[PDB]
Ligand binder design. Structure first.
Ligand SMILES: Cc1ccc(CNC(=O)[C@H](CCc2ccccc2)NC(=O)[C@H](Cc2nc(C(C)(C)C)no2)NC(=O)c2cc(C)on2)cc1
Lengths: 233, 212, 250, 235, 232, 241, 198, 236
């Protein structure tokens, strides 16, 4: 029943499940926590980075994709590189060919379709990473959740990774507050910082621990690490 | 363009002009026609400005790669043959270049190879290359002695470029002088023909074809 | 899409057997019996037309096939495998021989070529051996009349007389008894009809028997006159009427 | 084409196992020629012997092979060896040296050993040939792609038995006619039939062609084997 | 036993995890990153006294400003080094400047992803200097992941080595102190007595680039370590 | 398009196909090499399944790669022909483009490289071969001896042995070979080689073969008789109570 | 046109090749060796289009050396010349043919005969007592038709070439800067490195 | 590429299970068009309303909705779109619905032929108005499809099918587009009965000759509220 049905991605179980895809989904739960939330003027990413040792770096988890778009990762980091790179290209192609900034919604559809192929072709493997995508386009601010199954959903806020349920619970209740933080970046960031906290048995989030990225109406996508984030602890 | 390189008692002299043209338009007078490949290897450029600059800059990349792979400076023979083999791949597609690869190694001593876009590769003591080559040869060939002092060989090269700068419409600007020993190349300066001609005329008493 | 089985499906077992070739031979054994007899002025190949229901039209199924005007084939085992081999063999007689030399191939060489196609399915990726044995009978100016058997492995060998399929053991014995190196063609036809009476359960007439010869040149089967330097095909399917006439005086 | 924990090649070992059930072939090399003898697998009266060839194949004019294994697998290898010989001749205007042709066939065999996931050929060869570098030569190749050179050798069924006997009766200064005798005598004692008859043998010689200075390939006809069986005392 | 890029129920890649095991069996490599330079040391580990020790190349130059130590199935490192060198020289060709250490590492890790039938059996410590970010140390796993470290150790002795690196490292280590520490920590974890033949040191400075220390300069520091640790 | 991965990792971090390739090496006949002050000597052994062999035409175990470099192997003979061909093709290719013959280190690196590639490509098995590669760099006098194995690792050796019972002979060499004093004569360097092989082979008759390499492409094989002169000198004289 | 001459005497083969390399209006070199040793008893001389000339010679050289090392055996002159011919005959129909003409001079040790093969860029092969490529043939063929004898010694063959060169210095339009001479006999290949002022 | 001993394809069969496991979706044919509707599970309060569009257009005249693995559905529509483009390019006219059905048919069916591909884990309901009428189709993971008066797939398929059966029987004269929109809202509400652990959003689209000129359009604003209201009415 769970026997010869997790051999490859090209096999259905008798229940109708795709175990390889389910297992790839499991790499996310094991990944470090990240949060996303938006109002009507800005969208924000907050990613708690993880270190290997006390001597190591806190591996960067936020990747810029264009001037109006970017993402945070939880799972296999190499897989975030493959996909965000593909997203950089699709953004780029949109700019060159059409003089058009690519719509966040289209970015979602494109990522979905790329992940899908790997859930169906033999000798390939599903992507082992979840992604939070923020952007500002012609219809305003946006947050998207990418699941390696190929499922993408647009949200006001969310969180993925280790103990993500804590932050997602907090956000489900803080909803009507943060959605109204328009034209005030610093409070929306703060609301992101306080959201990520409900997911730490770990500890105090510190200077090299924290990563913030923001995009908005007259603000292009920018990542803040260390010195710049000190004012948010 | 006029470029030359000769071997002698005290190593190798390499001298080149610095003029670029398009048809009869003098495009530049300050172009660098010698490429420093490593402290022991030089390349000279004549023909198409891009062809030469591109492929010789590339030649430097391939020579550095040999250092890392074999933990050893590339031989002049093998550096020239990389250029020569590349250029041969392209034969017929209309690349235009005539170059000299010059340098010292412990195995070879001082060496000069002439390489052109026809695929020709020659080892030799004396080469002049470019539209001005014949003017250079004439001065150089009739004053060349193996026993020249470093000082005199430096001057001979310089003077031979002057010769060709003067008579060749497609040569001029300045002279760039190099000397190559066991210790590697040493740059012996830039020399504006504007100034050099008059100085040489007065001091040598030559160029009596010239008014004033 | 794409072929994703790029390895051999016929491999060696620790005993040195090649399983799939053995099993293909087992398939041949189930096959309806077929035979060939080589005479001094001809060759005969014959089989039973095992009908499936009397509603099927027996004449519309080719069990004995013309390969070249001088070469015929018959089989035992899987009919659909035979049919595609006949097509590829006809084509290769052209691409590999007639388009090069301007004349049809000698029997041993066409046989060599079928042998090649069958061997290939013994070793190529993602395929199973053909489930047939063929009997090829023919003539050429330099070797005269010949008869060969080709097996699933691509092995071939020449026979004076033989049979393959269901009742092969019984029939090989029967022919061994009756074969001499001085048989006329009509003698060999007669012996073929006798040997084939054993195999068969039900009716035994010209509409249940497929029989063809490789004999003399048939000028009236050429389709044109005027080039006296060919008299035509040596291959000749016997009609239902011709089989019965030999069965009355049997 | 994978390794066992022991360091042997499964499909190869099993292929050699396959060959051990095949009609025996012997090659014996004299001072002035090579003998090729081979035994046909449990045959019939109705099997045509006249126009039959299954174990002895001409490769060019200077080189023949004896086959032990899958007849059809050998047909493939013979054809591409024939082609290689013609490629060599076309390129150089000289007949191919025996060793070179042997090396090429062996290298083909080795391929199937190492890449592609296809099964090896179930075939062993004895090569008899002549070239002007090394004179008469006898080589052997098997599905591992391995080749070695021999004074006398056998392949297929009963090689242990046959190998013992050849060592017992072979001596360097042999003549061709003695080698013919030795070949037939060795097959007489290693057969599985009651006795050895003419319709169960293939026979070939590579001689110096009486008086000429030129190399001759002879593949013995039925009646010729029958005769050479009489002289030796096997009738 | 089913596939090469297969996921475990715990969401890890089987083959990537097993390659990590191979690295654990490798000779020890240690790197320390300071403000005066970056040091790389290795354990030669000759499988026999007849092996000529100085033919063991487990520290290799990539570009004048970038060096690298390996550990694991060192044969697999050949094409990574080659690719690393091509990337650094190509960058200089296209841009007339030194490649950034992080970019060089990212490129090697890109190569690592391309499984090629299997992952690499080797991990790399990549060290160098660039104008932007100064002296840097990188650990590059065959997963395609890489990590920046102030100090790191890889190979069989790495668990104990890392612990010792945890105590001994601070943001004010001089290069000569850092050399001594690499030597010390190697002496502890090596299954043999540390001398100039079974251990190799190297560093990169902004000014002098990447230099492998020859056996003579190493032997001196070994002698200087034996003494620094006698008095204390 | 068959690219099914054969060389994969196991849970303990071993590539079993590479491992079993080593097993095939240790199955193969023994080969040894030892370097002198001005020379390097390569020595082999022969098996005894049959001895009605023709030795003129049977592939010798020491192969010339270029005129100054030789390769001997333990393991699968068919595999080694493929590594030798490629090494020969490379040697000519290096002369053609670099206008110099290969260094021994370079040719070694190339061969080790080819072995490595076969440990990580789909639908290929590693080489069941480990090699000793010996000679002199062009215009150089310092002798060179290198070893490669199915994994692609390579290294240089004062002396080394490979194949069946190499454990035994490496024992002998480790006590006898002095780093201080390499066998300064060609002669006494052939001495240490035949001694080391005697532990494994039996009588040094039609089984032990030897090859000597001196600088400037000076490479001589030996004859049975010239070998017998070494077999004799040690047995009788090193028999003393 | 560069000068490529070959004369086959009784015990050896002699090749003479012009030393000049001229591009345009300049003689760039007066000491060029237009020859590659193919094996210890086989020598090839070449003339034709600028780059093609050496690239071809050295590709032929690489292939012959490879064969030698693989077989520990030297190919015959007849064999080498067939290899070369087929290579040229392939080249003539490719996207960009090699424009090179060759003389192959070898001593066959099996036969103990010396041999001279003339092959042009089209792949036209012929064995001759003497040969030449380019314009130079228009003077030497007739000269040698008169002065050549099949049983000449190597010293006699060198006097025959001296005539050939002197004739080419009297009547050819261009200064080919003298010839390098090389002999292929039973003892291999050597250079008469003193032909110019002698 | 594996038949089980009963003649079925066990991989297709497991694909069906995955569909049965999905959100419920429907299509209703009317007298001059087709209406489509789907149940959108509200996983969380954080989902942006009206913003995770499940229904997809093909060309300008064809609606597609599906149940099962949503990525599998999107892949299918992408292919449908190329198959539409390719048809228009060659033949000028927009692709007739029966023709578009076979294009998806053969493609889906192809993914049941080879051992290196898995079948699709969706059933798709699609249709629109072409030159001679409205057409409704449903296509199962095997590539089996037929025309329908009414169609349902997903977790609540049985309850939805029963409702559809009632309409067919009680409207032999034909239903109106305006009406079918309300009825579809009712049916999705009824069908939500078999999936009620989550809150849901309703999404409807239609292609009517007289209400949209035979183009596919979404049902928004006024008409969407009237449909929700009508469905809320017949549940209280
Ligand atoms: C670094 C360096 C600079 C300059 C030289 C000397 N060559 C030169 O100066 C050659 C001489 C003409 C020539 C000869 C043979 C082949 C092609 C072209 N000139 C050159 O390559 C010119 C340079 C140039 N062109 C221009 C303008 C923008 C066309 C006005 N300004 O400078 N480009 C070209 O002739 C050229 C034309 C086209 C098309 O692409 N390149 C050597 C080496």
């Amino acid at each position: 029943f769970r026997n010869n049905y997790d051999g490859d991605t090209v096999t259905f179980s008798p229940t109708g499940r795709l175990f390889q895809v389910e297992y790839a989904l499991e790499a996310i739960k094991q990944g470090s926590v990240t949060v996303g939330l938006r109002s009507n003027t800005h969208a924000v990413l907050v990613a708690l980075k993880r270190n290997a040792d006390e001597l190591s770096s806190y591996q960067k988890k936020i990747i810029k994709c264009d001037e109006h778009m970017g993402l945070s990762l939880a799972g296999l980091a190499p897989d975030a590189r493959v996909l965000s790179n593909y997203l950089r290209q699709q953004c780029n192609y949109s700019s060159l060919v059409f003089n058009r900034k690519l719509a966040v919604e289209r970015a979602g559809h494109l990522l979905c379709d790329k992940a899908q192929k790997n859930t169906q072709s033999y000798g390939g493997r599903p992507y082992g990473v979840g992604l939070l995508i923020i952007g500002y386009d012609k219809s305003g601010a946006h947050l998207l959740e990418f699941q390696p199954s190929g499922n993408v959903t647009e949200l006001y806020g969310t969180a993925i990774g280790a103990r993500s349920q804590g932050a997602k619970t907090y956000l489900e209740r803080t909803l009507d507050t943060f959605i109204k933080i328009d034209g005030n970046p610093d409070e929306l960031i703060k609301a992101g910082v306080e959201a990520i906290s409900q997911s730490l048995r770990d500890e105090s989030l510190t200077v090299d621990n924290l990563s913030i990225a923001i995009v908005g109406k007259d603000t292009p996508f920018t990542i803040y690490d260390g010195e710049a984030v000190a004012k948010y602890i | 363009t006029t470029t030359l390189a000769f071997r002698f008692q005290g190593g190798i002299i390499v001298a080149v002009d610095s003029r670029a043209t398009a048809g009869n338009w003098v495009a530049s007078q300050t172009v660098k026609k010698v490429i420093e490949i490593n402290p022991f290897l030089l390349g000279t450029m004549a023909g198409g400005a891009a062809d030469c600059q591109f492929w010789e800059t590339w030649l430097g990349s391939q020579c550095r790669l040999h250092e890392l792979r074999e933990k050893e400076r590339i031989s002049v023979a093998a550096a020239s043959k990389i250029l020569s083999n590349l250029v041969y791949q392209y034969k017929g597609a209309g690349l235009s270049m005539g170059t000299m690869i010059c340098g010292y190694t412990r195995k070879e001593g001082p060496t000069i190879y002439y390489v052109d876009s026809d695929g020709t590769r020659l080892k030799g003591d004396i080469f002049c290359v470019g539209s001005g080559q014949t003017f250079a040869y004439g001065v150089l060939d009739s004053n060349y002695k193996w026993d020249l002092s470093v000082e005199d060989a430096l001057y001979l090269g310089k003077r031979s470029i002057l010769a060709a700068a003067h008579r060749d419409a497609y040569s001029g600007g300045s002279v760039n002088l190099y000397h190559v020993t066991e210790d590697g190349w040493i740059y012996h300066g830039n020399h504006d023909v504007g100034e050099l001609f008059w100085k040489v005329k007065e001091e040598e008493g030559s160029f009596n074809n010239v008014i004033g | 899409m794409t072929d994703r089985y790029s390895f051999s499906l016929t491999t060696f077992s620790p005993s040195g057997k090649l399983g799939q070739i053995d099993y293909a031979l087992t398939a041949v054994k189930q096959g309806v019996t077929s035979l060939g007899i080589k005479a001094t002025n001809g060759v005969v190949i014959a089989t039973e037309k095992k009908s499936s229901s009397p509603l099927a039209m027996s004449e519309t199924l080719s069990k004995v096939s013309l390969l070249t005007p001088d070469i015929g084939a018959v089989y035992s085992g899987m009919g659909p495998d035979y049919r595609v081999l006949v097509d590829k063999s006809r084509k290769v007689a052209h691409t590999s021989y007639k388009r090069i030399y301007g004349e049809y191939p000698p029997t041993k060489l066409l046989v060599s070529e079928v042998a090649k196609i069958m061997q290939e399915a013994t070793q190529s990726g993602g395929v199973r051996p053909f489930g047939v044995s063929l009997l090829i009978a023919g003539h050429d100016e330099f070797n005269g009349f010949s008869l060969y058997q080709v097996d699933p492995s691509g092995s071939y060998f020449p026979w004076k007389a033989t049979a393959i399929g269901k009742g092969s053991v019984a029939a090989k014995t029967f022919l061994e008894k009756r074969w001499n190196d001085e048989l006329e063609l009509e003698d060999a036809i007669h012996i073929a009809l006798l040997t084939l009476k054993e195999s068969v359960e039900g009716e035994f007439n010209g509409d249940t028997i497929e029989l063809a010869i490789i004999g003399d040149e048939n000028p009236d089967l050429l389709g044109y006159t005027g080039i006296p330097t060919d008299k035509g095909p040596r291959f000749r399917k016997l009609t239902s009427q011709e089989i019965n006439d030999r069965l009355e005086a049997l | 084409t994978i390794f066992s924990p022991e360091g042997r090649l499964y499909q190869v070992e099993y292929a050699l196992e396959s060959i051990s059930h095949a009609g025996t072939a012997i090659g014996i090399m004299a001072s002035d020629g090579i003998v090729l003898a081979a035994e046909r697998k449990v045959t019939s009266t109705l099997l045509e012997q006249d126009t039959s060839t299954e174990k002895l194949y001409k490769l060019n004019d200077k080189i023949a092979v004896a086959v032990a294994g899958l007849t059809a697998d050998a047909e493939i290898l013979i054809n591409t060896a024939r082609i290689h010989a013609q490629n060599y001749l076309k390129t150089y205007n000289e007949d191919i040296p025996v060793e070179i042709l042997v090396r090429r066939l062996s290298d083909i065999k080795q391929g199937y050993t190492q890449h592609g996931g296809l099964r090896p050929f179930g075939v062993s060869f004895i090569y008899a040939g002549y070239d002007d570098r090394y004179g008469y030569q006898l080589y052997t190749s098997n599905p591992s792609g391995n080749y070695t050179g021999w004074k006398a050798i056998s392949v297929g069924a009963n090689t242990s038995a046959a190998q013992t006997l050849l060592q017992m009766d072979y001596k360097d200064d042999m003549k061709v006619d003695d080698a013919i005798e030795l070949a037939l005598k060795t097959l007489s004692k290693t057969t599985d039939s009651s006795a050895l008859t003419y319709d169960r043998l293939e026979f070939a010689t590579i001689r110096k062609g009486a008086n000429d200075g030129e190399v001759y390939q002879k593949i013995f006809k039925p009646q010729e084997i029958k005769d050479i069986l009489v002289k030796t005392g096997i009738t | 036993d089913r596939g090469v890029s297969t996921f475990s129920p715990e969401g890890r890649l089987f083959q990537v995890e097993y390659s990590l095991e191979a690295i654990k069996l490798g000779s020890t490599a240690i790197g320390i990153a300071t403000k005066e330079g970056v040091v790389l040391g290795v354990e030669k580990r000759a499988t026999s006294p007849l092996l000529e020790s100085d033919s063991i190349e487990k520290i290799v130059e990539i570009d004048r400003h970038i060096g690298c130590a390996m550990s694991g199935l060192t044969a697999d490192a050949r094409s990574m080094i080659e690719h690393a060198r091509t990337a650094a020289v190509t960058h200089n060709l296209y841009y007339d400047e030194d490649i950034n250490v992080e970019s060089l590492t990212q490129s090697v890790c890109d190569l690592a992803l391309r499984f090629m039938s299997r992952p690499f059996g080797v991990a790399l410590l990549i060290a160098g200097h660039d104008a932007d970010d100064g002296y840097q140390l990188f650990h590059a796993e065959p997963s395609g992941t890489f990590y920046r470290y102030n100090a790191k150790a890889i190979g069989s002795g790495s668990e104990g080595a890392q612990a010792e690196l945890l105590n001994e490292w601070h943001s004010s280590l001089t290069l000569k102190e850092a050399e001594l520490l690499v030597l010390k920590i190697l002496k502890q974890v090596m299954e043999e007595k540390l001398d100039e033949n079974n251990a190799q040191l190297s560093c990169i400075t902004k000014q002098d680039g990447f230099k492998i220390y020859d056996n003579e300069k190493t032997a001196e520091l070994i002698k200087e370590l034996k003494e620094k640790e006698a008095a204390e | 398009g068959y690219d099914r991965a054969l060389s994969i990792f196991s849970p303990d971090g071993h590539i079993f196909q590479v491992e079993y390739a080593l097993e095939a090496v240790k199955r193969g006949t023994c080969a040894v090499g030892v370097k002198g002050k001005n020379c390097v000597v390569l020595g082999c052994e022969r098996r005894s399944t049959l001895k009605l062999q023709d030795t003129r035409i049977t592939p010798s175990k020491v192969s010339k790669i270029d005129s100054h470099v030789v390769l001997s192997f333990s393991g699968l003979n068919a595999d080694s022909r493929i590594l030798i061909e490629k090494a020969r093709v490379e040697a000519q290719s290096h002369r053609l483009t670099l206008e110099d013959p290969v260094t021994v280190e370079y040719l070694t690196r190339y061969v080790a490289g080819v072995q490595q590639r076969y440990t990580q490509s789909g639908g290929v098995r590693p080489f069941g071969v480990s090699t000793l590669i010996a000679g002199f760099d062009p215009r150089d006098d310092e002798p060179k001896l290198y070893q490669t194995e199915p994994s692609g690792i390579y290294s240089s050796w004062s002396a080394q042995t490979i194949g069946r019972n190499s454990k035994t002979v490496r024992e002998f060499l480790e006590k006898n070979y002095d780093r201080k004093e390499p066998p300064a004569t060609v002669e006494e360097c052939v001495k240490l080689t035949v001694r080391s092989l005697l532990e494994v082979v039996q009588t040094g008759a039609k089984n032990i073969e030897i090859t000597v390499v001196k600088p400037d492409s000076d490479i001589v094989a030996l004859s049975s008789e010239e070998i017998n002169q070494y077999v004799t000198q040690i047995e009788q004289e090193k028999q003393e109570q | 046109m560069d000068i490529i001459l070959g004369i086959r005497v009784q015990d050896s083969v002699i090749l003479a090749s012009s030393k000049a390399v001229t591009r345009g209006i300049s003689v760039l070199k007066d000491s060029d060796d237009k020859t590659r040793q193919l094996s210890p008893h086989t020598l090839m001389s070449f003339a034709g289009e600028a780059g093609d000339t050496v690239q071809f010679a050295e590709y032929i050289q690489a292939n012959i050396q490879l064969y030698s090392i693989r077989e520990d055996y030297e190919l015959s002159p007849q064999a080498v010349s067939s290899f070369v011919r087929q290579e040229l005959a392939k080249s003539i129909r490719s996207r960009r043919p090699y424009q090179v003409n060759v003389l192959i001079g070898g001593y066959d040790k099996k036969k103990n005969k010396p041999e001279l093969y003339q092959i042009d860029y089209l792949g036209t092969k012929v064995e001759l007592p003497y040969g030449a490529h380019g314009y130079s043939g228009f003077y030497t063929f007739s000269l040698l038709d008169h002065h050549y004898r099949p049983d000449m010694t190597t010293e006699e063959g060198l006097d025959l070439l001296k005539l050939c060169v002197q004739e080419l210095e009297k009547r050819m339009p261009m200064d080919f800067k003298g010839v390098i001479v090389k002999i292929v006999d039973k003892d291999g290949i050597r250079q008469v490195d003193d032909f110019q002022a002698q | 590429s594996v038949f089980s001993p009963d003649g079925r394809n066990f991989q297709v069969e497991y694909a069906v299970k995955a569909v049965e496991n999905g959100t419920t979706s429907i299509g209703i044919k009317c007298n001059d068009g087709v209406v489509f509707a789907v149940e959108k599970l509200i996983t969380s309060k954080l989902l942006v309303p009206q913003k995770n569009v499940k229904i997809q257009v093909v060309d300008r005249h064809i609606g597609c909705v599906y149940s099962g693995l949503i990525p599998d559905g999107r892949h299918l529509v992408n292919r449908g779109r190329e198959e539409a483009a390719s048809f228009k390019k060659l033949y000028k006219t927009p692709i007739p619905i029966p023709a578009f059905a076979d294009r998806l048919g053969q493609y889906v069916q192809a993914h049941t032929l080879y051992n290196s591909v898995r079948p699709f884990g969706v059933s798709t309901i699609f249709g629109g108005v072409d030159k001679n009428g409205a057409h409704l189709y449903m296509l199962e993971p095997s590539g089996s499809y037929w025309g329908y008066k009414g169609a349902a797939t997903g977790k609540g398929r049985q309850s939805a099918k029963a409702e559809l059966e009632k309409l067919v029987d009680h409207h032999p004269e034909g239903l109106s587009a305006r009406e079918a929109v309300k009825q579809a809202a009712k049916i999705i509400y009824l069908a939500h009965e078999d999936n009620k652990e989550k809150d849901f959003e309703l999404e409807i689209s239609w292609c009517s000759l007289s209400e949209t000129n035979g183009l596919h359009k979404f049902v928004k604003g006024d008409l969407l509220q009237e449909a929700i209201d009508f469905a809320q009415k017949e549940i209280n």
